[PDB]
Amino acid sequence: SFVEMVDNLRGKSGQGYYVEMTVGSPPQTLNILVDTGSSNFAVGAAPHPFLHRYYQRQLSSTYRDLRKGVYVPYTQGKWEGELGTDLVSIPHGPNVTVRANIAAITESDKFFINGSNWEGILGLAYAEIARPDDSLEPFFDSLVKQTHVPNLFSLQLCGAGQSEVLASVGGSMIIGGIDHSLYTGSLWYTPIRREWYYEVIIVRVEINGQDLKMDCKEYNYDKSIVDSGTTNLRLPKKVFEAAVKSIKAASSTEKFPDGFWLGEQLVCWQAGTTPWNIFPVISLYLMGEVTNQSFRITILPQQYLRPVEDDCYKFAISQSSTGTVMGAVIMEGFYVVFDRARKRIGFAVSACHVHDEFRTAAVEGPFVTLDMEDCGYNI
Ligand SMILES: CC(=O)N[C@@H](Cc1cc(F)cc(F)c1)[C@H](O)CNC1(c2cccc(C(C)(C)C)c2)CCCCC1
Numbered sequence: 001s002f003v004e005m006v007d008n009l010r011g012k013s014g015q016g017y018y019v020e021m022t023v024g025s026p027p028q029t030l031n032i033l034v035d036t037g038s039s040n041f042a043v044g045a046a047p048h049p050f051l052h053r054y055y056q057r058q059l060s061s062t063y064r065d066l067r068k069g070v071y072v073p074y075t076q077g078k079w080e081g082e083l084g085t086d087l088v089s090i091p092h093g094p095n096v097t098v099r100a101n102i103a104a105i106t107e108s109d110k111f112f113i114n115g116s117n118w119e120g121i122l123g124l125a126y127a128e129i130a131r132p133d134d135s136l137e138p139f140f141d142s143l144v145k146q147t148h149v150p151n152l153f154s155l156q157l158c159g160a161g162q163s164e165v166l167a168s169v170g171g172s173m174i175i176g177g178i179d180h181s182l183y184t185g186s187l188w189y190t191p192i193r194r195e196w197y198y199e200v201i202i203v204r205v206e207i208n209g210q211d212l213k214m215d216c217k218e219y220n221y222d223k224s225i226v227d228s229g230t231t232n233l234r235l236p237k238k239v240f241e242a243a244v245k246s247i248k249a250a251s252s253t254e255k256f257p258d259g260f261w262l263g264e265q266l267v268c269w270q271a272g273t274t275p276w277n278i279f280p281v282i283s284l285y286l287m288g289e290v291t292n293q294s295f296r297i298t299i300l301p302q303q304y305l306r307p308v309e310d311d312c313y314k315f316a317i318s319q320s321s322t323g324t325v326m327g328a329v330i331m332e333g334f335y336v337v338f339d340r341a342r343k344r345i346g347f348a349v350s351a352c353h354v355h356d357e358f359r360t361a362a363v364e365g366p367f368v369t370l371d372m373e374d375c376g377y378n379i
Pocket of ligand 1: 033038072073077325
């Protein structure tokens, strides 16, 4: 924990959160997307039209070629690179330096985003999903192994709160501890089912207090994960359809185009007249540390209606064919502790949550649910 790590994240709405890092000797400054949905540390290392700077290995005295190729395909972006090791620091993180594996990006497609202000990505998940394979020690594992930094990190992603520019966002990545000033109320923990993605189990879903009443295996159909690198709440097909049906009904007083519900087309209102009260709250109940217990995290429309350029919003809930992805919009307004040491993820109401006059984002428990290990997908 540390006061000096507060507000060390920045970003543009919809384009992830990044932290400043240095690579090489002398230190080369780069902005790096913080991604709990992947396990590779990678940086642009060759010219690209959307990169204004990049990692130049030749300028680093501490660089070492691993003489090995590496490739990672994400949801739609992808890159190819060359492995190596170098000294890495996080100026606004812990006061330490570590020799980490680095994928030097030489080719890419739809990976770098025009005007995002980041030049690389920091995969914070486990070795099991790293490319080329699990022998390439992820950054966080190197940090804990080489230093005395406790095996734990927390993320406080904050919302937007202009005009023709994407809203700027901020947050905090607290490495090695829990900063108690970043949250209120109690921290509730859900088990990390398996150490590969940050996998969890959802046992119940409600929209405005109404249970979807689905077999809980559906909520984790495939898998459920906590992914700071994906913007939206992504839901498996059957859950998505049931959720949008209910959100439509709650906000039936008004009518929006199908494009809006499909996440692509935007929807606007005059400034300050956004009818937040017609959109329902969504509660995801996560499995507790104790069998038969659960806790819920409640999400407001201020989280799932993401603001965009020129008051305009996009529906930030979309369909998945690879499980539930609790992306940035779900993490916003919560303090999320990735307690790797004790294989669990904690949630607490964030100090930067969306107040709202009548409703608020919340973390509450316990709630007693008969049977929860049966909600998982058995390999
Ligand atoms: C939108 C997106 O692609 N986000 C990625 C980071 C990112 C951010 C960005 F701004 C631009 C990019 F090109 C990439 C996440 O890593 C996605 N994470 C999952 C995933 C999807 C596809 C392969 C993979 C890996 C890297 C593990 C093979 C992991 C998502 C589905 C559930 C599993 C996790």
